[PDB]
Amino acid sequence: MDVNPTLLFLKVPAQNAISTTFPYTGDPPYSHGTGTGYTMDTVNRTHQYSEKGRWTTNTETGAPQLNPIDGPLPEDNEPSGYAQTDCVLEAMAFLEESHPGIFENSCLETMEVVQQTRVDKLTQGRQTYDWTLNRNQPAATALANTIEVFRSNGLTANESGRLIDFLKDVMESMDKEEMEITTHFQIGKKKQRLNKRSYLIRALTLNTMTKDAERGKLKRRAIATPGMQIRGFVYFVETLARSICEKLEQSGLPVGGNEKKAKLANVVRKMMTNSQDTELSFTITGDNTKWNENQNPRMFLAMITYITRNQPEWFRNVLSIAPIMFSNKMARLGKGYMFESKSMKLRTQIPAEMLASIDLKYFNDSTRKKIEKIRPLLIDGTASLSPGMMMGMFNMLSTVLGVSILNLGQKRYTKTTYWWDGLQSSDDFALIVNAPNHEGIQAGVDRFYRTCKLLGINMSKKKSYINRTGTFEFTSFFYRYGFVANFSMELPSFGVSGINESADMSIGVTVIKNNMINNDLGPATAQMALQLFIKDYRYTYRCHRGDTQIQTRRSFEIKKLWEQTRSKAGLLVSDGGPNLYNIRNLHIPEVCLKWELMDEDYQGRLCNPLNPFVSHKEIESVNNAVNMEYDAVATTHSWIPKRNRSILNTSQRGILEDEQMYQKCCNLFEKFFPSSSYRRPVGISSMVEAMVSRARIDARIDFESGRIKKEEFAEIMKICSTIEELRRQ
């Protein structure tokens, strides 16, 4: 007998066993070297799918830009980025007709947000390409460097702590005849100048990288990261787009998984049960090929201009700016390329900027073709990527266009027996088309395809299929007359998260409890998940039961603690104690569960505030792990782990001292202002001015009614006067 697990599908349906078709127990595919090749490939593709457009030379950047809007109509079933402005505007008009008042209310909400939002909100983000160092840097690091360089140049409106003032400064930096940046060497610094075009290409450029740990693809794809200048305008645009998508029953992007399933089920119910039995109904469970490549930012600008009609011109401009920057965006090629000489046994790293000048003898025919094709677009080491968006920066607006296309089948606009509706999240859609016969179904799916090609949205025929209503798939959710649990997407989340010991226990038992609630994980599987998680936890953190003979570097202290203690059921798994977790106790932390069994000496040592291990920085990160909210108790096991410590060998050493002393400063401010941690401080007053004035008021109020007598009040006032004098001088 030869064993075949796939034959299991001869008795169990494919959706009730789809977890078997998910190889999510092994290393996900990773990239190894440069990502220049994929960046060039994407540039050449997105310039190929729009080649019948019109060419231009930008007067500001000097880059060759391809405009496919209002271009010729496609003649074959290949991908096309030739979107039609009139059709986009008609889609928006019919969208407003079907949901009246949606754009007005969304614009009002976004105006309120624009008026209220602050610059600190840009600190909550991923890596951002800092244009001052030409390096990916954390969002707060990039914001700080940009703010510093602006203040070094005279654009200090951003000190208002409002996002719109930071955007006014970003826009006013381009009308300057010379930027001023600083570069490190070896350790000191050097001043450098940037003419208008250099700063323009630096503000408009995007960084490129390969995306690691992607499940479900044989070949690697590239992704982009924008700078600080485009992130505020994109924040406002994404705010508007979310606000719109919230009011549409056909959008699916701004909502979670469970409400996504609810929406899908409601739509399927509407199309099956309400409609008569005579009509047929077919579900296309489809995807979109090259979704981002064909999404021109000029049609996002047109959509924004339509949405912001009859509105203050300032709001229209602030929301229009982001598409304007994306239309002129540049893409950094990547890391570069490595050359090996086998006879001489040597290697060499060439940067991507040299590709414009480098001889082409050293490249394989594929790279020779890519470089030769892309060289015209290369301006100062970056390729003009105007013809389309890269990897969904405008995700919510793409979902808005998709919901418009889904809303264009209501049967009031088709004016025919067939109609359609569905749910789309960017790059993936499910379409229920209802019609009286198979010719009507074919005509409805042809009109859907064609109306999708007039907006630059291409349907993947290789990865899409149409069946009867009742069975379909949407974002790895398999609906078969009702939704079905998968549990294979959530399998890599069933181990030690890797924050610390307390957080790992909390996150592991909350992930078990959630998978029990949401993904129909069983009771026995949940108990075994507990057991295996605890085994991994003990092995990873060298914290074994203590009645064992496992020799580790931390196996001696655990036995001394085990032997000191009389009540051994009160010890934490992190200190060498038993496991009291079960199904009933998945919603309780490990410190409160064992609290009544603990000894008072151990109980007071563990939960000691003076411990040198617990540090908490901000209210947002106290019990939140990238997002997994995890209820936990602050104990001595809540340490922070160590840092990369690889900056010591690089040109950038002065950031460590700057950040150590900035943390000093922030701690002193927290001493002066107790609520600097809870509520992010707001104001416009300088550090020393606020600190000295606050201290002065405290001394005055203490003298009037408090401990402070004349001596200490006078001393404080004199010292504060000294601080003010030293500040002014």
């Binding site: 954390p138 890797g498 001696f556 609290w595 922070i640 400063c665 200490e712 601080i723």
Partner: protein
């Protein structure tokens, strides 16, 4: 005093002087987040790879003067090397366990107060009482449900200001806490945290957890309570229910909500059954709410609602007096009355007998969203004052009062098909049928009532047929008002009788309750109802009803197969097919039933004919009373979301298809049991 000296020391250095001078307060976050350390894309690999090096964790530098460099075995606990961007020192994990075996001690009494929510969860679970596990299909309906169990009904922004007023009274800003609830919360909470020395940030996050509301879409069946959703991983599964009763003393609002929903559902199911009283009693015994049985709450809890009163009266108990009408609760306050057993005609010329009452009498109307006071005479209204909340509430109260008046102005307004027979072929109460007819719109009752003059006393507002106040001429007897509450609350409980069809009565002979007074509304329980019965799909819906009916008949096929042959009338007259009977045309209920019974009879008569698929398909249609006929049917329609889905008698269908290869039956795309 120390802090200002620290500030002089920071200001002394020129570089720190430029950091303090240039940085504005708005940027406090940015420089707090300024760090070279990139966030770990793969934290697991970075804590599995990192936990194999000496000194993998970090700690404050005070550890260097509190813990020794090595233990008795000689293993190092900390190093003199510093973290990358910090003054903190690199230490081994042996510094943690050493701290737990030989470090300083304190008093941890503060922590129970600090982490109140978690200890309340522990106390609620420790005292809970489990019971039998019931293996049954779980209809988990995705719904937004409140996760937090101590939420004081304050939003995150709403409660951040109370948290600040409690912990940080000088940094609150312009926000004045107007609401009294916030003000009581502030005074009470301030006392508990007088000296807490954990951290004011942790005390603020504590008050965030206790006070901040939180909602999450979750697949929920039953439950819906704060204390029953925190254990949703333990109470609810895919095929199993776990009876559970948290430890915390339950609020009685939730309990009475569940009591009314349960009583409504039961009363509705009882109306359509064959013997409503027996079924009602058996179901109330076999059902429980929040763990506690239904009888316990019904004997202990006094609650005013029609279904609860019917349930109580069926248990031979006291029941509140002050008869009700059209869902409203009437209390007479003056006069006698006698019925007359008289006859009259309508505006649509239909003849009818009714019982009109004697004497002048005043009444105190009460309701869910309205209130009124009425004075009338024999067949004649005298005056009506109303106290509704919304305009349609006043309209409801006014039409109810007009119907109660029994005036010919109302009798000569009835127009259309108003048949006084129920789904069960039970003649219906006339009064409720009129009151249901005049609830679509009572336009004809308004243009046919009459007109009188008014003295314009008190500055009272005029009446509205269609939102037209008339301050000098108005409906006759009818007034406009808006009281806060009815005259006074009635609490005098009476003895009653009940017919089989739940027509409650009083000692004199008048009518007191009926299954028509119960609401037509469909609510969502706050506590998990454990309506234990073979049929739990009472309110589930038609698709579930069909699938589960076919599943039941599959599971109990072994005894239905022998009851179908011997004594089949108690199989047709069975308490399991009544939800299916709720479906299937109301007119062709009898024709379909007789058809199917004749099929089964001629299938039993001739030998050599037996198809289990036919019986399992057509049995739910033979439940109804048999109406004879001469025709035949090729399909059978069933109402699903207003659409008539057709079930094919011969062969498979989208509603009923039995695979002959794998022997699985499938209802509506859902498996409904293997067939033998």
């Amino acid at each position: 005093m120390e802090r200002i000296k620290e500030l002089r020391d920071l200001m002394s250095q020129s570089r720190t002087r430029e950091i303090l001078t240039k940085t504005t307060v708005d940027h406090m976050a940015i420089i707090k987040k300024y760090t070279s350390g990139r966030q770990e894309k793969n934290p697991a690999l970075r804590m599995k790879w990192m936990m194999a090096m000496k000194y993998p964790i970090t700690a404050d530098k005070r550890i260097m003067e509190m813990i020794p460099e090595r233990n008795e075995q000689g293993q190092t606990l900390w190093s003199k090397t510093n973290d990358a961007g910090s003054d903190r020192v690199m230490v081994s994990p042996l510094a943690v366990t050493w701290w737990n075996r030989n470090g300083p001690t304190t008093s941890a009494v503060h922590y129970p107060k600090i982490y109140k929510t978690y200890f309340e969860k522990v106390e609620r679970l420790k005292h809970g009482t489990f019971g039998p596990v019931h293996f049954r299909n779980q209809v988990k309906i995705r719904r937004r449900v409140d996760i937090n169990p101590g939420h004081a009904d304050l939003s995150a922004k709403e409660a951040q200001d109370v948290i600040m007023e409690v912990v940080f009274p000088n940094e609150v800003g312009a926000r004045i806490l107007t609401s009294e609830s916030q003000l009581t919360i502030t005074k009470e909470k301030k006392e508990e945290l007088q000296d807490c020395k954990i951290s004011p940030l942790m005390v603020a996050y504590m008050l965030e957890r206790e006070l901040v509301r939180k909602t999450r879409f979750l697949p929920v069946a039953g439950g819906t309570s704060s204390v029953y959703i925190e254990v949703l991983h333990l109470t609810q599964g895919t095929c199993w229910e776990q009876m559970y009763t948290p430890g915390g003393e339950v609020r009685n609002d939730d309990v009475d909500q569940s009591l009314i929903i349960a009583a409504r559902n039961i009363v509705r199911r009882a109306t359509v059954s064959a013997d409503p009283l027996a079924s009602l009693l058996e179901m109330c015994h076999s059902t429980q709410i929040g763990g506690i049985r239904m009888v316990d709450i019904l004997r202990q809890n006094p609650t005013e609602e029609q279904a609860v009163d019917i349930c109580k009266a069926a248990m031979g108990l006291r029941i509140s007096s002050s008869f009700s009408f059209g869902g409203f609760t009437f209390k007479r306050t003056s006069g006698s009355s006698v019925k007359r057993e008289e006859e009259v005609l309508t505006g649509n010329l239909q003849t009818l007998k009714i019982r009109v009452h004697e004497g002048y009498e005043e009444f105190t109307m009460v309701g869910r969203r309205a209130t009124a006071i009425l004075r009338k005479a024999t067949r004649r209204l005298i005056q009506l004052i109303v106290s509704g909340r919304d305009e349609q509430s006043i309209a409801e109260a006014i039409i109810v009062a007009m119907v109660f008046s029994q005036e010919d102005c109302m009798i000569k307004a009835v127009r259309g098909d108003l048949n006084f027979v129920n789904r069960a072929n039970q003649r219906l109460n006339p009064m409720h049928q009129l009151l249901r007819h005049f609830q679509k719109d009572a336009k004809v009752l308004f243009q046919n009532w009459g007109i009188e003059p008014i003295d314009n006393v008190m500055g009272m507002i005029g009446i509205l047929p269609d939102m037209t106040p008339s301050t000098e001429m108005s409906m006759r007897g009818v007034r406009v008002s808006k009281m806060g509450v009815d005259e006074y609350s009635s609490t005098e409980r009476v003895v009653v009788s009940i017919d089989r069809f739940l027509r409650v009565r009083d000692q004199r002979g008048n009518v007191l309750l009926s299954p028509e007074e119960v609401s037509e509304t469909q609510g969502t329980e706050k506590l998990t109802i454990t309506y234990s019965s073979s049929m739990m799909w009472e309110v589930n819906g038609p698709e579930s009803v069909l699938v589960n009916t076919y599943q039941w008949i599959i599971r109990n096929w072994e005894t239905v197969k022998i009851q179908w042959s011997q004594n089949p009338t108690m199989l047709y007259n069975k308490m399991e097919f009544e939800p299916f009977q709720s479906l299937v045309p109301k007119a062709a209920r009898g024709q379909y039933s007789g058809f199917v019974r004749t099929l089964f009879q001629q299938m039993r008569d001739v030998l050599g004919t037996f198809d289990t698929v036919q019986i399992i398909k057509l049995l739910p249609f033979a439940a109804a009373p048999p109406k004879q006929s001469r025709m035949q049917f090729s399909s059978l329609t069933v109402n699903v979301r207003g659409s008539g889905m057709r079930i094919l008698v011969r062969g498979n269908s989208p509603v009923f298809n039995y695979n002959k290869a794998t022997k699985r039956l499938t209802v509506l795309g859902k498996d409904a049991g293997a067939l033998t």
